[PDB]
Structure formats: structure tokens, C-alpha cells
Amino acid sequence: LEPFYVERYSWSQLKKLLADTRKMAKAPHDFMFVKRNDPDGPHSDRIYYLAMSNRENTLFYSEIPKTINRAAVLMLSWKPLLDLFVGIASYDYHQGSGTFLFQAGSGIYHVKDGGPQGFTQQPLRPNLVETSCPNIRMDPKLCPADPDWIAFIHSNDIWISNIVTREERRLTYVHNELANMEEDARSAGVATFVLQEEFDRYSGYWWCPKAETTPSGGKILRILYEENDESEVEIIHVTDSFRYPKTGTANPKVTFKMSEIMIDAEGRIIDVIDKELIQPFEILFEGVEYIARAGWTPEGKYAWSILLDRSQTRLQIVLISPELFIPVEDDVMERQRLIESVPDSVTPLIIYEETTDIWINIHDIFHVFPQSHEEEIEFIFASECKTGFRHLYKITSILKESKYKRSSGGLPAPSDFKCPIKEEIAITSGEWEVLGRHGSNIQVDEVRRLVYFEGTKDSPLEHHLYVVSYVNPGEVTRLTDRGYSHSCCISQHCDFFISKYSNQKNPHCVSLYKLSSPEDDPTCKTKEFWATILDSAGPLPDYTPPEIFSFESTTGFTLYGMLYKPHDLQPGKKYPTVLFIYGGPQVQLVNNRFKGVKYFRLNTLASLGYVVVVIDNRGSCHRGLKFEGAFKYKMGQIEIDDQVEGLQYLASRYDFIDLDRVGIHGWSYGGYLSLMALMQRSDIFRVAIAGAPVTLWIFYDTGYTERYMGHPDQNEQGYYLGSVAMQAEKFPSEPNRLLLLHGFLDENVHFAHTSILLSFLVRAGKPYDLQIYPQVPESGEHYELHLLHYLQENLGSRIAALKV
Amino acid sequence: LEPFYVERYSWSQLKKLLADTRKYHAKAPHDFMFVKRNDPDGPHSDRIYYLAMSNRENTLFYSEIPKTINRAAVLMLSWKPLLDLFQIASYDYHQGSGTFLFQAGSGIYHVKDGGPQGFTQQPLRPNLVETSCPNIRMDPKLCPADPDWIAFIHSNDIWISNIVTREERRLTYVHNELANMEEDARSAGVATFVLQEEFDRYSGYWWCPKAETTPSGGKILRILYEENDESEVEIIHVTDSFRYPKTGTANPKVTFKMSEIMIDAEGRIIDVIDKELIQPFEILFEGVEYIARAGWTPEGKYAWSILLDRSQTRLQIVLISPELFIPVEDDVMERQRLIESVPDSVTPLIIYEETTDIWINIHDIFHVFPQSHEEEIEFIFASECKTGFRHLYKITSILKESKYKRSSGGLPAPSDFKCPIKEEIAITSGEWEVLGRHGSNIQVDEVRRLVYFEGTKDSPLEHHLYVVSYVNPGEVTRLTDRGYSHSCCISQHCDFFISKYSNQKNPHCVSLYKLSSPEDDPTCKTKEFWATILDSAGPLPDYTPPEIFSFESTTGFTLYGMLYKPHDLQPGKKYPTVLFIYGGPQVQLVNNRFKGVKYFRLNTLASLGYVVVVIDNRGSCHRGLKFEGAFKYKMGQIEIDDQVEGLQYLASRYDFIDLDRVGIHGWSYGGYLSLMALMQRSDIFRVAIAGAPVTLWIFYDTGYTERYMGHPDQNEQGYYLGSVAMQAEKFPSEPNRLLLLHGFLDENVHFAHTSILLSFLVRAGKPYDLQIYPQVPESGEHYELHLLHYLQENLGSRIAALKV
Ligand SMILES: *C(=O)C(CC)(CC)C(=O)Nc1cccc(CN2CCN(Cc3ccc(Br)cc3)CC2)c1
Ligand SMILES: *C(=O)C(CC)(CC)C(=O)Nc1cccc(CN2CCN(Cc3ccc(Br)cc3)CC2)c1
């Protein structure tokens, strides 16, 4: 077996090869179905969605016909909703009025369609909500109880504004804009860094969905909101500063607050009264670090919240009445009556609690049914804690009076607020998970008593839509067709669903499917193709996809992988190998989806004469909690074994793989593992190429690394062995093997990780190559050019072998 | 001619090689002072105090100068430690009392020796100057009028302290340590960044050398000081804040202040009166931007200052009477009363003014004789503005009353303060310069009416000590021996001089020389070796020194260079050349000094089989102002021509030079020219290694850049052509030719320079290599290791030749 050598292109030649092969907007999303209610008309519903037609992301609509010509395929035409000459990231809507509310760059706008007014046949002019606020307004939301009232964040304080009457008013006075960030670190209604970046919670205030009518003729509106104090949180810089809770250090001091807003009969604000918790957050919510999720029950009786402890091994779903909040009062004497007056039976209600010895994965599945009984709450939740796979559970919890009393003046023990679990039925089960992250959620048909959900049941390589009864869980019907991975949303009316779908050979496609039942059985569901929303681009003419392989690992698990064979493969020749890797939690690289957009250059590597390989090691997602928990306290230690094992599987199966010329490359956690690969297994990996690597886990934030490695004090050995900067001596003492890539202005994986590794590489007397991208297509073009040229000169070409 | 290729060592072998050649390898005695013993029975005439080292702290030593020597033998002066080790970079001294003052770590200490109290025979214990000041005290100075009083700087304000009574007091209230430096950017008695970095002025206050006695039996002590406001100056951050005046942008607002301190008969402070100039600085000193130097006349009658304009083409010497300062008064009537109280005859006295079409070079030479006439002042100054070479000039200026009167209410016209010149005599002349920087200065013997000075009269490759009369200047006697470059100081008594000397073959020695006259003529001076202070290490066996060469350039100047011939030079073989370079203003690499300490590694390159070349192109110092003025407005445009001309001279003279394997390397301005070399002349230079280079003149400071390039608006093309980051597309599209080296925390040539270059190299599609030193001997050893390997792999070795 002779060694294949890649063509030794010059720098200018390689650049021209990439500019030619290089020569992709956001697919329709955030769908919403509105019924026409016109017996005489041809359409049943109108759908609204956000999409990109190099254009602005904007609102569109399409008409859903009552019947279709089944010999033909219906292409829905995209009608623009807005009359334009930046982008809309998201939008709010209110069914009873037809009111849209959205943000577009610097402005908060509104229009009306599909309400009691009716349906437009032409683009609508966006109506600016006028303001006196100097700076940018963020996170706008319609009040569900009254669509004339919006809310938004301005300079870390909550504001409200009436779109009809032009009235505007600040609700919180927690921050001053002229004051600097070091002295003033408080905020209201805003999710802080860690909750946005590690828990995917972006809003920090929640409109109460119902209005309480006052005897006078007016009404009371409410806003639950978190208030944050980041004073004791660590500060860091980059070429102004921000608050980054480094692992083992302080997270922000949190609490819940209620803004109570009084309006008269004419829609004019009578007064605003900010209210705080009757006892501090630490007392009521013992051991809780993070407010992971929050909201209200359907009728606004209780606020709810999903609460985590610091270690993220204890989760709590807690109901919170508005009666628990009392006015923020100056005078302690006037205040003391307000505390005593609140009854002792009015308590926080921990309606659900669970624990794990691995970690809690937060998700967006949580559905609360209407209250049939004052003493009970009925809801669907998802959890991995019972079986190690995420499954839907229908739960009923009794709302009994707490044994603890506030008049006694004592402090409450852990279990004082626990509610008894009356019922707890498993809706789903098996060796596969329900998806609750990144848009995946449930849709609950309350009439037919069904629940739609996305799952890995048919394969860990494909997401599919399913439906099941929640009253008597039996058969789970798959609604999406096999051979594609899907991403779906279901109409609020539960008679339609849309799927964004693709597989390895075919680019993404968006289609509408009508749902039906047989007359005899409403429980049973069938689907029928209705129309195309976005047609597939067609198979890319010069992109050759990889083959999804697998193998039975010594670890017990099956491990899946992608293999790009070298193009124009000559028999009796062995080829240089490039291992691409991410390998960290919350990500799966290997699945039946189209990879020719993001990972197009893995094809390009195959075209040059490289064997590209991707392998999802233990710790990757969509394989259950036990699979994910394999590296708890052991980040860096187990991942390369999996990668090497899968690499050796392919080597004995395919002798076109040269094991002597193996390179590895990854970004972020992939860069981390690329460095570990060169440190631990230099016998296997000739070159490592680390992009934005994590080199030292004490430099990373609380929410992420404490979940997977615990508090640093309790795991000095795990933090040591998993940090590459504290093991610089283990890198090779020969150059052209280690390449570091990093942006200067990196917000997640700071340049500190790179420069501390560099600082320790200099101590150890070890060689490295470095590239920087100080601020953009230009950087990406240069990265790919430099990367290919590096693999050529130090791995693939004939000079590569002669260099050693 | 066969090409020689260097032996391709591994990274471990090179590290080892460097470690062994380093294994065989301290501040030489400096800041000397001669104190007379005054004992007609003792064996010693003088004791000499000096700062010196032996990896030890730099500390004060003393040595005994004997009245006679054994003239056959050679006397080694033994170093007696003056201080007892603690439970020093500079020092102050009071002759009449024998008081030493110096900062050592956080503390300011004092001891007594060589005064009335006599001479110690053992080390003294340093006495701490006690303080209530929280922060570190800087720049301690003794009041020459009273040795009980010191001044120091603390949190950018001036303080004083009495070392007998322990009274401590704050004189200025200009800065608040609590306030952040965006708000608080004022300082008192401190030289700002540009004046420390580009003019070598470190102190910003000056004690008046005499005390004015009061009627009560007390006295008035005085301190002249500069007050700086840096509010309008540009700020930069480096991984704390910096006030960095970028070229074309604002320098600090400056003024002179005067602090009148009233002391009673028993040495207690009665009062402190802060005093400002009668009219603002801009009115009294029209056109002045920089306070370059300042002090007092010997009798404390006037303050003097050397004032520069922004272009640095006008130098003034002004006398500033203490009568020009009135107290600070917020009250408007009280202040207006004080202006009219000062006579109109009290005026700034511009005793000297010069101009040039090139630039003013600031120096430390300025000597004022005792005032005989109240309307005449006599002084020695040095200047290049007459002949183009720096020479000593004795001047007598007449102190007439100005024509401008403060009562008339107008503003002074630009020459109203200019004194007439009664006499101006050249003490020296010729095609060579007097040295006035980096310790070089004059010593004026006022009895014999001679001036001792250092200069380049015998050669531009050696500094020598000379003496000449200032009354009837004729014969200039060289006092130092040929075949060595010298750095000297003369005893205040003018009967001794010390020389720190070396040459190309011999490491540095420090020897003492006694001065005498023949009995018939005190004007004539002879020298005799007296004793050694520091013995030579001897020629080191490892180190082969370079040969100095010269060539007659086409530009009309002789240009000098150094040549390291390869070690074990083979017949019929051509070797790879490394051109090492600085090539910027104020520096001379090529002279008859020992280069085996700092430039040892140029010898190491010759031991590996490289030809090493150093050439002092036009712009270098020690060749007069015309030679230096070559690149006026044209930095980066002429330097490489001279380098390439000198290299071609050596090539046709020596067949062992391989002109197809030339690399270039340098730091700071040498890194700049290394980039320019690869950009302008890719034909000659294969590889360029640029260390901490200026890539953009608009990012460098005012004091340096505007001196040589003028203001950017006056020189659009020079700034474009001279800034390499503006011309990234002119770099090669072959990799392994450009290596950038930079520290991350550099505060002179900032990382900004490299990061913007990288941005434009990335945007232009050009390859580069990069190494960083995030903060130390480790950094240096890795730099050397990487630099030898980089040249091996990309210029010298066999693989390098194949790699093209
Ligand atoms: C890591 O998680 C972060 C954020 C997602 C943060 C540190 C990161 O930095 N991601 C990041 C940085 C730079 C570029 C990308 C996009 N990435 C590049 C690699 N590409 C595969 C590939 C492209 C070209 C060639 Br040649 C080989 C391989 C996938 C997309 C992400
Ligand atoms: C430039 O003037 C500055 C400040 C003095 C500011 C940018 C500077 O950075 N100087 C600087 C940086 C780093 C190292 C030095 C010391 N310098 C290195 C080169 N050396 C000669 C040499 C050593 C090794 C080899 Br291999 C070849 C040549 C002289 C000392 C200065």
C-alpha cells in the first residue's frame, strides 16, 4: 500500500480554488395559524411566519386552501405582511384583536391582521410606537389581557406604553444610565449573561395573562419579573466590560418582583405599585441559584417557575401567588401590618421536585391544564430523572396549606412547601428521548386529549413528529416520513403541522401537512401532504455527502460517525486523514441531515485527497442521560478514546486510511479536544488545529462548567486533568504539529484561554503556530485558505513527509 | 560556488544548544561621586560612592582613593558596602551634611556619611522616612537649602517630609486617588508619558537651592513644578488606563507652578502657599508645547527652562523669576489686587533662541556660571543649529526690561521677552559631535576655566573624553586611550575621572584616572592610571567578535557596518545571510564596543553557518544632524536602500555571501524596517522577522513621530508610504517569508500596531506567521529557540531550499 500525496498547490492557487468552489437565507419559521372563518371563501386558515426572501428577515403570510388538487403539488406563494422599501428576529401576537408587535432594529412597531377587523390583501404599513426614551428599547411584549398595552426593557428597567393613547411610563427604578457599570450593577426584566448563554432564557419579565376588574370600573394588570444584582459578580474586559460569573465564583443575587398597574375606565394609568416578596428569595426558595424558566398559569391565578440549585442536580416547579407580594415600603411601621395581614396558608407551592446524580437538562416543555378543582393542579412536564431518557409525564399535585406559619416568626425547613403528588402517569417511555430544546416543544390538543411531540424513537439519527393520548397512553403514532430528520411545529388548532426536513443527500425543505381522524375514532391520527412552503434547492451537483457509519464500542454503547471517502479513490493507495470534532455536551454532529452548507468544506477536503471523519463520542446528545453523563467530572479524559476507537474501526475496515498521517481539527470544545488529542495521543495524531479552544476550565462560566464538572473546590483533580494550559509540558517538542486559531474579540471563549495556554507553552519551551482574526467573510476566507495550506504542507503533501 | 546548508537540528537539539552556550553567562558601577577626606595624616584623598551589582540588588558601595600608588603594581579598589541589608536605582546627596536619600522598594530611606560627622568604617543602617501616606512614594529629593527636608510624589501630588521632626505635609491637591482617571487626569510634579519616553525627563519638580530668610528667624523654601492636565489626551487600555498622546492629537495642557513653604526658627511649617503664573502659560510662552528641561540658577535667583514648540524646530531657554508667581486666589478682587502689585519689569527672559529646518535634539548639557552683573547672565550650552554638529558654546545674554507692560492691558508680541546676545563663542568645532545624552555631560572647572566633555572627534566609532579652555578655546586634549569606546564621569573637584570602557574584542572595564597639570601651565592636562574599579572578564573563548567595515556610499556618506564571518569557513561555498537591523533615529549599532553581551546570539548564528550583517543606514546618530536628517518626512523610504547597498558591497567583496538566501530581523524600529524590506524589496529578502514593529505612524506618539515626520496633515504621502499596515497588499503571497513577534502588554509600541497589520494582511489575502509573549527569561529563551529554528527551516537548511 503506497501513500497518496495531495497536490502541492501554492498559496495563490489554493485561494483561487476556494473562491471558485465557494461560488442560503433563513428558512420560514415562527409559524402561526389563524382561521379565516368564512363559509363562502376558499381558504380555511392563513399562516404567518418569519422568513428571508441577501434580504431582511421579515413577516410573510400564505393562504391555506380548504381543498387541493391531489394530482398536483401546491406551492404556497409568500405574501409580504409589511409595506417596506435590519430584520425581525421574533414577534408577538394577540388573537382577539389581530395585533402583531415586533422590533425591527431601533424601533418597536405594530400592525393588525386576522382579528375582528379582518384580513388584508396588501402589505401593511408598520406603525411605530412613539417614545421619549433616548436609548434602544428591547424585548417588546403585548399584554395578553389588554392589547393596547405593551411592555419593553430600556436601560435595564421595565417600561410600559399604550399604543392607542400614546401614554408611556417607567415601572422600575433599579438602574441609572449615567452611572457606570462597576458602581451600578442592578437590572430588572433582563436575563443575565449565564441564563441567556447557558440556559436559553432571554426574557426576564412575564405579563400576567388576565385582568382583575376593580370595583371602580377600571382594572389591575400585573408583570412578574426577576430583579438581578450583579455587584459581587466578576468583571472582565475586551477591546467596555461585562459581568461574567467565572466557575466557583458568585452568580447574581436574584429575586422575584410584581409590578401592579392600575388603569381607569378610559385606559389611563391611575397608579403603579411595585411589590416585593413577603420573605426574601433565600428563605422562600431554599438552595436555589438559578431561575431557569418562568410564566403564569392559563388564567393568571399563580405565577410559576422552574428553579435549580447551584449544582443543577435538584429541579423544582413552584407556583407563586400574587398574594405573596407586598408593596415596597419605606416605613417599617406601616410595612409591619402588610406582612401580618397576608394569611399564613398563602405559601409557595412546590408542585414538583426531582433529583439526579448526573445533571438536570432544562427544556421548554411545560403545559398547565385549566383548573377543574381549587385544591389541585394538573400539568404535563418532561424529565430524564426517572429512566435516564426524556419522557412526558402527566402529573397532579394537591395544593394543601403549608404546615409552616409566618405569624410564628420561625424559618421554614426544606420540605415545608412540598405538595403531595396525587398522580404521575408516564405518557411516553422507551430507549429514546422526547425533544424539548431549540424550538422543539409539545402541542396539546385538549379536546381529543392528545399530545404532539418530537422524538428520537425511530432512530438517534432522525427527529420525528409523534402523537399520543395523555389520558390513556398506548400507541405512539409517527406522523413524519422516515429517511429524513424533521423539525416541526403544530397549528394551535391541531389540524395542521409544518415540517422543516432534510437528509444527507437533500437540502432542507418546508412542507405543510393536514391532520385528520377517522370518523369512528378521534384518538387516531393520519396526515396528508397539503402544500410546499419552501421547495428544496435540489441535490448539490458537486457536493458528495459522507456515509453514516457505526460500530459497537468497548464502552458498551453504539457510536455513530460520518466518513467522507477521498474523491477519485485509487486502489492500492493509503490517504491522509483529517478528523473533524466537536465532542462536547448539548451537540450531535452525526445525524441524517444535510451537511453540505455548514460542513461543505469537509467535502472540499475529500476532493483534495483527504479522508474526513466525524465521530460523536460519549457526552454528545440525543442518546440519553447515561450516555451524556459518561464524562461527568472527567471532561477531556474519555473523549479521545472514543475518537481513536472509531478511527481504528475504520482503519481495519478500509485500508485506504493511512494511520501515520492523521490530523485533527475542531472549534470551541472541538479545539479543546484537538489539543487534548495532541497532548494525550501524539502517537495517533500528527497535527492538531485548535480553533477558539478552552484551555483552562476555571476561566469558563458557572452555568456550563459547574454542571459538567461540579464546583472547582470539590474537583481540583478533574479541573486539572481537563485543563490543557496546566499541562503544557505534555505537548510535543517538535514544531508544525500544533496550530492555534482565535478571534481577539471573543465573547464566549475569551482570548485569555489562548494567551494563558501561550504563556504556559513558552514556560515549557514548546513550539506552536498561531493565527488571529482581530475583528466578516474576509476572516473566514483566510481561515479556510490557511487551514488547507497548513494540512497540505504539514500533513498531506510530499514535502509534508520529507519535512519530519 | 556550492551552497552551504546549516545542519538541520531538531527543536530539542536547538533548545539544548542554546542552553549550553548560555551556561557560561550585573550593572557596572555608576552614578559616581567624589568626597574629599580632608585628613593630612590619613592615606586617602577621596572616597568614591557608587551604585553597583554583583543576581543581587543594586545598592550603594564605597571605595578609598589613596594619595599615592605603587606605579609598577595595579591597584584593585575593593567594594565596601555602605548599607546594611534591609530587614536602589538612584540617590540624592547633600555635601555639607553628608545625607544620602534614596528609594528602596516601597520605602524612602536615608543615611549619613562623609559630612561633618565623618566617614564610616562599616555598613550603615538605612533610616526609614516615616509616612502616613497609604500608597507608594516616588521620586524622593533632598532640599539642597536644608537637608532635614525632602520632597516626594504620592498619588500624582507633591508632598514634603522632615526627616528629623517627622512632620509630613501635602503641597498640592490636584489629584484624587479615589476618583477614576476618566474623571481625574491632573498631576503635579510628575513628567507625563511622552516626556519620560521621548525626551528622557523623569522628574517634574525642582527644589530651589537657596532659602530666603524671614524677619522672624524662619525661612521660605521653594519648589518649582509642572502642573499637567491630561483630560483632552487620548486614552488606551492594556490587559489600567494610559494617557497616550497619539500623533496629530492633543498633548497635555501644561503650566509652571511655585510652592512657597514658610518654616519657623525651630524647623516647623508655618504656612504653605501655592502660586500660579501671573498670566497663563500660553500667553507668557507663546508657541511652547513641551517643557523639555528645567532647574534653577546656582544662587536660586531664577528658575530656568528649555522650551520646545510642537514641531520641535524652535528651542528657547527662558529665565523665570519667582516674582512672576502670585498666590492662587478664587476671589476676583483679591486676585486682581495681586496682579497690579507685581511690577511690569518682572518678565520672562528668553536668554537663548535657536531654530532648525531638521529637528531639535534635546540634551542634558546646560551650565550657568555665578552671576557677577545683575543685568548679565553667562552660560555654557550645546547646539547643532549653527554648523550641523553638536558643539559647546559659551554665551552671555543681557537681561533688559521688556517692552511689553502688564499695565497697558495688551498681550505680549512674540519677541518682547527676547534678551540680546552680548557674546557668543564657539568652545569647540569640527566634523564631529559633543555628546549630551544617556549620561554624557560636561564638567566645568571654574578655577582653571576648563570644560571636560565627551565626543566623536577621534572617530565616530569611539566616544572619548576631552578637555578644553572655555575662555580662549584652542587645543582640545583627548584624555582617553585609543582602541576603546569610553563612557566617563569627572569628579566635581576636577582632579579625577572614571572610564567605563570596552572594545570589539574586550568586555567592559571600569578604571580610575588621576588628572594633573605641568607646573608651568594649569591649562594643560595629563592623565595617569590610578586604580581599577571593575576588572575585565577577559576575552571569552566561545565568542568570536565581528569585523567593523565601511563603504563609500553613492549618497556621499561613509556608512559603517559589522560583519560576522561564518565559523569554520569553507573554500568554494556560499552561506545564507541574516541582516540584523535597528536603523532608526537616536541609535548607533556599529561602533568599537563589546557586542558579546547583548548581541552574543549574532555570534551563535555565525557558529551555525550564517553570515551576519549590521549596517548603520542614514538616520543613525553620532554622525551629525545632516546625516541624521536624511529621512525627514520620509521614514521607511531610504533605510533599506543603504542596507541593500552595504550588502551588495559585501557580496562583490566576499564570494561566501549568498544573495539568494538573505533574511532580515529587528526589533521596534528594526521590526518596522524588516517589514519594509520584505514589502519594498522581495527580490533581495527571503524572510523578514519583525519584532514589536511600528506598522502605522498615526498610532505612535506626538513627541517622537512629529519630530521626524511632522504633523499628518502636513505629510499625507510620508505617513502613507511610511506606514506598512496601509500597504498590506504589497506583501508576498508566498508563506514562510513573514514572521511577526509581539508582546501583548507592550506600552511603547502597542499590540494595536500588530493587530491592525494582521487585519489588513487578512483582508488582503496574505500569509503570515505569529508568536506572542503574553507577559521574564522564559520569553527570551523561547524567542531565541523559535528564531533559530524559523531561520533553519525557512532560509538556511536543505529542506528550506526544497520548500520553495
Ligand atoms: C464555539 O462553540 C464557538 C461558537 C459556536 C465559540 C468559541 C465558535 O467560536 N465557533 C466558530 C468559530 C469560527 C468559525 C465557526 C464556523 N465553523 C467553522 C468550521 N466549519 C467546518 C469547516 C470549515 C472549513 C474547513 Br477548510 C474545514 C472545516 C464549521 C463552521 C464557528
Ligand atoms: C524597541 O525599541 C522596544 C523597547 C526597547 C519596544 C517595541 C522593544 O520591544 N525591545 C525589545 C523587545 C524584545 C527583546 C529585546 C532585546 N533585544 C532582542 C534582540 N537582541 C539581539 C539578538 C538576539 C537573539 C538573536 Br537569535 C539575534 C539577535 C538584542 C536585544 C528588545
From Swiss-Prot, chain A:
GO biological process: apoptotic process; immune response; negative regulation of programmed cell death; proteolysis
Listed GO CC annotations: cytoplasm; cytosol
PANTHER family in the record: DIPEPTIDYL PEPTIDASE 8, PROTEASE FAMILY S9B,C DIPEPTIDYL-PEPTIDASE IV-RELATED
Active site (UniProt): S668, D746
Protein name: Dipeptidyl peptidase 8
Modulation of this protein's activity: Inhibited by zinc. Inhibited by the serine proteinase inhibitor 4-(2-aminoethyl)benzenesulphonyl fluoride (AEBSF), and by di-isopropylfluorophosphate. Specifically inhibited by isoindoline derivatives. Inhibited by Val-boroPro (Talabostat, PT-100), a non-selective inhibitor, which triggers pyroptosis in monocytes and macrophages.
Gene name of the record: DPP8
Annotated family: Belongs to the peptidase S9B family. DPPIV subfamily.
Main location: cytoplasm
Highest taxon listed in the record's lineage: Eukaryota
Chemical reaction(s) catalysed: Release of an N-terminal dipeptide, Xaa-Yaa-|-Zaa-, from a polypeptide, preferentially when Yaa is Pro, provided Zaa is neither Pro nor hydroxyproline
